[PDB]
Design a protein around this ligand. Structure first.
Ligand code: 6SF
Length: 273
C-alpha cells in the first residue's frame, strides 16, 4: 500500500489547498511531494476517462501530466476514507516564486522575462489540454533552482476550459479581474491574461499592484520601482479594464518586451547559481 511505497519526510506547507509533505518513493529513491486533501473540503468533483469519482484536481492533473516539464506532474493518487492522497513530482533544490521575490526583492527584467515566458508556455500547455488553472500567482509557481525551470502547481481551484461564461471563482481575489469583482462573470482566457498582468507587475515591482476591490475596478497602474517603458506597456495591456482590450497569448509573446528570452539553463547560470 501507499504507506509502504513512500517514506514521509517533513511538512512543506498547508492551507486552502490541504497539507503537502516532502517524500521519497521507496523503489527508486525518487523525490516526491505527498498532498492530502480532505473529502469534506472538495466542492468540485469530476470523473476520469474510465468514470471513477475523483476530485476535479485529479482530473485536471491527468489532462496536463505528460512530457512537458512546465506543470508539476501527478505520479499517482490514492483514496482514503476521509481524504484523497496525491503523489507529485518534487524538484530538488526548489523554492516557490513568492519566497524567491520575498528574499530577493524586485527581479531584474532579464530574469522576469525568462520567468514570465516560462509561465506563459505552461499556461498555453494547460489551455491546449482543455484545462483552466484559475489561480496563477507567485505562490503557485515552483522554481527548479538547478535547471532554471518553472513549474505550475495547485490545480485545486481549476476547471475544464470552456468558451462560455464562468460564474464561480475560488482563486485569489487580488489576482481576480474587474469583471469578476463587479459582475461575478468572466471568460477563461481573458481572466488568465489579467492574472498574468498582476504576476508580471509582482515580478518587476516586488509586490502586487492592487489590494482593494476599488483599486482593481479603477485599474490605474502606478509603478513603485524603475520599470522599462516596454515592460510597463505590456503590464498595462494585460491589465486592460475591458476583457476584449487585453492581448491574446500570441500578442503577449510577440510583444517587444518578450524578445530575446534566455534559455532556462542560461537563466540558472546567470541568476540562480
Ligand atoms: N504550497 C506548499 C508546497 O506545495 C508543494 C506542492 C507540490 C510540490 Cl512538488 C512541492 Cl515541492 C510543494
Amino acid at each position: 500500500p501507499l504507506e509502504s511505497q513512500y517514506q514521509v519526510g517533513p511538512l512543506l506547507g498547508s492551507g486552502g489547498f490541504g497539507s503537502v509533505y516532502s517524500g521519497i518513493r521507496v523503489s527508486d529513491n525518487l523525490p516526491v511531494a505527498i498532498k492530502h486533501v480532505e473529502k469534506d473540503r472538495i466542492s468540485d468533483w469530476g470523473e476520469l476517462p474510465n468514470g471513477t469519482r475523483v476530485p476535479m484536481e485529479v482530473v485536471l492533473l491527468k489532462k496536463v501530466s505528460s512530457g512537458f516539464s512546465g506543470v508539476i506532474r501527478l505520479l499517482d493518487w490514492f483514496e482514503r476514507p476521509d481524504s484523497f492522497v496525491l503523489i507529485l513530482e518534487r524538484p530538488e533544490p526548489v523554492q516557490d516564486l513568492f519566497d524567491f521575490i520575498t528574499e530577493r526583492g524586485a527581479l531584474q527584467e532579464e530574469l522576469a522575462r525568462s520567468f514570465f515566458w516560462q509561465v506563459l508556455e505552461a499556461v498555453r500547455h494547460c489551455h491546449n489540454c482543455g484545462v483552466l488553472h484559475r489561480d496563477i500567482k507567485d505562490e503557485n509557481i515552483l522554481i527548479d533552482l538547478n535547471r532554471g525551470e518553472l513549474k505550475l502547481i495547485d490545480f485545486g481551484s481549476g476547471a475544464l476550459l470552456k468558451d462560455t461564461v464562468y460564474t464561480d471563482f475560488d482563486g485569489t481575489r487580488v489576482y481576480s479581474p474587474p469583471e469578476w469583482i463587479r459582475y461575478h462573470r468572466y471568460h477563461g482566457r481573458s481572466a488568465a491574461v489579467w492574472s498574468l498582468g498582476i504576476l508580471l507587475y509582482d515580478m518587476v515591482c516586488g509586490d502586487i499592484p492592487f489590494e482593494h476591490d476599488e483599486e482593481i475596478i479603477r485599474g490605474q497602474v502606478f509603478f513603485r520601482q524603475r520599470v522599462s517603458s516596454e515592460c510597463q506597456h505590456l503590464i498595462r495591456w494585460c491589465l486592460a479594464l475591458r476583457p476584449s482590450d487585453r492581448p491574446t497569448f500570441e500578442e503577449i509573446q510577440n510583444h517587444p518586451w518578450m524578445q530575446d528570452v534566455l534559455l532556462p539553463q542560461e537563466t540558472a547560470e546567470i541568476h540562480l547559481h
